[PDB]
Structures are given as structure tokens and as C-alpha cells.
Amino acid sequence: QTIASASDDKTVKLWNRNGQLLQTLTGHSSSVTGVAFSPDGQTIASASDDKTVKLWNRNGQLLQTLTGHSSSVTGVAFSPDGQTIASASDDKTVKLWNRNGQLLQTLTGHSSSVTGVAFSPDGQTIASASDDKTVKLWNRNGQLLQTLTGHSSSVTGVAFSPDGQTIASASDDKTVKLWNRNGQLLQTLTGHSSSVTGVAFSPDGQTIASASDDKTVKLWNRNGQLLQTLTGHSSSVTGVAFSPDGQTIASASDDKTVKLWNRNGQLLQTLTGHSSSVTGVAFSPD
């Protein structure tokens, strides 16, 4: 029932499905690059080029600042149990933190910026995307488990399926790739005409959504067959998310809006109010 949007205007905004602006989270000193909700939906985390993650409540109160990366933070995620936060950074690391802001681990191994991060559904694997053209899988002790190789250019985003067996990656090489947890390449999804900027799984695991600089969202089945292309944004699409009931898709764009869509490609709502590019979007667990 609540949508969060991240923006180059240095804020997060919270909205309802009817299009009302509920709250603006103000306090980062540079662009906000991604956003996530805790599993209980009551805490929001934001990632920023000001090199921090910030934690907020729905009244807009700043609750905590996570300081420790040496360059921009590019993405943030909560573990399924809510106890651990993961952050991705241009400083080439992922950091793991507890909810009070203390650093637990630094995951070292990528050779270029880390662009996104995700947890497996069982909470036991972390996946990271990088400009070094790989996804890496790690445990919560920081040990490297696998390196997923095969993209020809930067990897911009990564997602787990709800059943924790399949990984999806998005890339500047204009494809999404699907993988197993052993690092094997299963499928390449081709069809976008420019960089793919983000990827997500539907909650039933049957559908993949991709966002692209080609101004569209595309929806795909598990065999990599293109189902549907969502057209309407007027500038690059920078991220995509599914609602928990899987009946709504949200897209973020450099055209400064979020758009909400249903499963048949109809446009439901356009959320207007950010003064710069929208860089990411998330749904609360309800």
C-alpha cells in the first residue's frame, strides 16, 4: 500500500496507491540512489552519493546514519529477518550493518564500483552487481562463494527469485541474464535497445521485469520469452519493482516520475513531485 521513490533531488518520497504524496524524507546532502523498506514496513533505508545510508520512519524522522563507505552508496537492502542491512558502493565493497548502524562486515573482491545488492529469501546469501562485469555471491561472514561471469559490460542491478534458486542480473550490454546459485548461466534475455538499469522478480517467481535506458519496462517469463513492453516514460527508466500481491508494477525514470502499472500493461498512476531524476523505487511489504 506504500511506494517509496529515490531521487537526484536528494529526497525520498512516500506515496499511496491512489497517488497521494504522504511524506518527503529530507536530510541527505547529495543524490539518493536507492531505497528499501524493512520487512515490517515501518523503517525506510535510503542510499546516497553523500556516502551514507540513512534510516527513517514514516513520520519523516531521521533515525540513524550508517557511515563507513569511502565513496557513493549505490543501493541498499534489508535481510528477510530484518536484522541486517546491506549497502553497495562505488568504493568497490558491500558493507553489512545491524539496525543500530554498527558495521558487521566488509565484502571485498569486486574490481570496480558495486552498483546494487540483494539478499536471498533464506537470508543466507548476498548478491552484488558490479561495473567489473560480474555478480558475486557471498555469505554473511563476508566469504566469497561464487562469481557469475558472462555479461559483456557493467552489471547495473541484481535480484533473487522468491524461491532462492534463480538470480537475475541487468547490464549495460542490453541484456538480463538468469543464473543458478552455482554460477551457471541459464538464459540471456534480449530485446532492449539500450542499457538495462534494473531487474526484479514477481512474488510468484513466474515473471521478470527489466528497466532500461530505452525508456521501457519489459516483462518476461522464466524461459526468457518477452511477454509485454510498458511504454509511457519519456526518458530512461532507472528501476522497477513489483508489489507484494504481484498485481502492480512500479517504474522509476529520469523523466522525474514513478509510474504504476497493472499486470496487463495498463497505466494506473503517474507520481509527480520530484524535481530531478527518480533513481529507484520500492513497495512496502503490505
Residue numbers in the entry: 1 to 286
What does the paper say about this structure?
While the space group and packing differ between the crystals, the structure is identical for each protein. The crystal structures also show that the proteins are highly internally symmetric with a backbone RMSD between individual repeats below 0.3 Å. Analysing the thermal and chemical stability of the WRAP-T permutants revealed that nvWRAP-T, lacking the velcro closure, is just as stable as the variant v13WRAP-T. While v31WRAP-T is considerably more resistant to GdnHCl induced denaturation compared to the other proteins, its increased thermal stability is not that significant. Just as with WRAP-T, the inside “Velcro3-1” position is highly resistant to chemical denaturation. In both cases the “Velcro 3-1” position yields the protein with the highest stability, especially against chemical denaturants such as GdnHCl. However, these two examples alone may not be sufficient to determine a clear correlation, and additional proteins will be needed to confirm whether the inner “Velcro” is consistently the most stable conformation for propeller proteins.
